[PDB]
Design a protein around this ligand. Structure first.
Ligand SMILES: [Cl-]
Ligand SMILES: [Cl-]
Ligand SMILES: [Cl-]
Ligand SMILES: [Cl-]
Ligand SMILES: [Fe+3]
Ligand SMILES: [Fe+3]
Ligand SMILES: [Fe+3]
Ligand SMILES: [Fe+3]
Ligand SMILES: [Fe+3]
Ligand SMILES: [Fe+3]
Ligand SMILES: [Fe+3]
Ligand SMILES: [Fe+3]
Ligand SMILES: [Fe+3]
Ligand SMILES: [Fe+3]
Lengths: 178, 178, 178, 178
């Protein structure tokens, strides 16, 4: 039985470029986490308590995704390489602008997964494409959800009254089309 | 015992013009269904999740009405004739305009039932008038409900804040005067 | 952030040919729905109440699949285009012939999904292949089920006694190999 | 306050021809009752226990309809006139022939109600048409049910095995399309 790079028994070797792509993607998930933390703080500073609670939870969820990926590398007997994490953006001129960054962050997270997916397909790594499939499925829902929150905030057209209503929706857990 | 046109034992023959009118009315119910589906999509595209849920349910209900009519023809030993279904309208400039189409669609559905009713009366078909009576009763309630939703949307006068409030009413199931 | 064709924030553009293929597939699902409605009526006209109940439920399920696809287009920020729906077939010489059409309809539905799948793969649209994967999985079960019902009806060899027994199986909810 | 023919306070006089038609219709209901009793006995004599139980219940139900009509005459302050009741038919060459008589009896019962209905309309007796409306509604269901039982018996094509299966359906309470 062969030994994998992390020292565990190796079911099948992984291409080093694919390994690097997964390690980099873990950093994307972690960066999404700290970005949602920054967004939760921005919302709390403006008394948007529902948005604060929503993004506080999204930050924890993105961290969970990152750990899920680290567990996949363990399962494949590959080394993890936890990287330096950049500071998040922390300033926005409006909630609409913040929600635009959040949507783009979600879409960028999917693009990163898609790039790993294509690399796995090029290397005939079916374990990895199967691993990523439910994560892309979840990204579709997250993109649908963030398009909903962004579009609803934009519909408010900067009216504080409408933003307070939406803020209360989020505090109540009404965060998608349903 | 006589055989009806659909092959079952025939309790009493039905005038062919009345039969044609019922078959055409089934198409009206089906067209209302796909129209409410189109309206549910229009609302979902604009993050009006409560309106989306309302019209998604109305579409299923209109389909149920259509099937209810097909069952009446079976019970009368008459043939069904499921027809080509036109594409629904799919574009509106505002929610107020969409709600106007919905109300008119509901009133037009009642007019179709009324036209079948008059034909049954001309032919002394008491089974059919008795069959239609509760459906007209339901139409009164649906017309009252759609007048309520349309009037409430018009009261909002295009203010996104008021439309978000009404949208949340609909998601909560607050869809008529009560 | 870019705007998609249906006006929502766009996570990633979709190839227009793939979009057309999905819109056409929605029509296939809707056509399967009205076909199963027609089959339910044919069975009701011949007092095959179990087959009537089975196909009445299949019609509602196929409609649900169609709506599921419309929701995917919403989630991808693509326009829906609900199309004219052809009249279903409504005449069969025997239950065995009707069940043959039903099986072929199910297999044709899968072929349509497979054609969309191949187009998504040609365009590297992983969101779409992930979206379709569970639907193909469900098609395998539906094909297995319709092969079971068709084969059991054919085994009956046109004997009304055996067809009454199978009819009662279906009314009881015994609709697959289990 | 005026006194009605049965001695109670009279809300509105009833045309004597309409009164005669209602009294005659009560005899039709009673005759349907004893006919279903005769049919229940014919089935019991041939060990068709499910058909026996079904018709035993139908006989009691038809009697209940008759009493319901006598109560309407009381409520209208009209005299009842319980009439001589003819002997029922008691001989049939087959279950299919018996079921044909039963269906025709049900349709003939509706025709009698329709004839009373038309007379009430000619006399602008809205109390009577309102009274009859739910009864016609019930007749539609009974006609649908007897068309189902007759058609299913005819499908059996005289095969004792299929008739035993249907007999067991009826004993279990499976007596309509559902
Ligand atoms: Cl804003
Ligand atoms: Cl509006
Ligand atoms: Cl067959
Ligand atoms: Cl027989
Ligand atoms: Fe993530
Ligand atoms: Fe995310
Ligand atoms: Fe309707
Ligand atoms: Fe309606
Ligand atoms: Fe389907
Ligand atoms: Fe299907
Ligand atoms: Fe999968
Ligand atoms: Fe009766
Ligand atoms: Fe009766
Ligand atoms: Fe009524």
């Amino acid at each position: 039985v062969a030994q994998g790079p992390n020292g565990r028994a190796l079911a099948e070797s992984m291409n080093p470029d694919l390994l690097s792509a997964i390690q980099q993607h873990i950093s994307i998930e972690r960066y999404a986490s700290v970005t949602y933390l920054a967004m939760s703080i921005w919302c709390a500073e403006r008394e948007l308590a529902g948005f604060y609670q929503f993004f506080d939870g999204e930050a924890k969820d993105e961290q969970s995704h990152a750990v899920h990926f680290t567990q996949y590398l363990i399962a494949r007997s590959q080394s993890n390489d936890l990287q330096t994490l950049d500071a998040p953006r922390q300033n926005w001129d409006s909630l609409a602008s913040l929600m635009a960054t959040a949507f783009q962050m979600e879409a960028d997270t999917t693009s990163s997964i898609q790039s790993v997916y294509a690399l796995a397909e090029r290397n005939s790594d079916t374990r990895t494409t199967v691993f990523l499939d439910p994560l892309i499925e979840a990204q579709i829902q997250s993109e649908d959800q963030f398009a909903y929150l962004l579009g609803r905030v934009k519909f408010a057209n900067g009216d504080p009254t409408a933003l307070l209503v939406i803020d209360n929706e989020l505090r109540a857990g009404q965060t998608q089309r349903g």
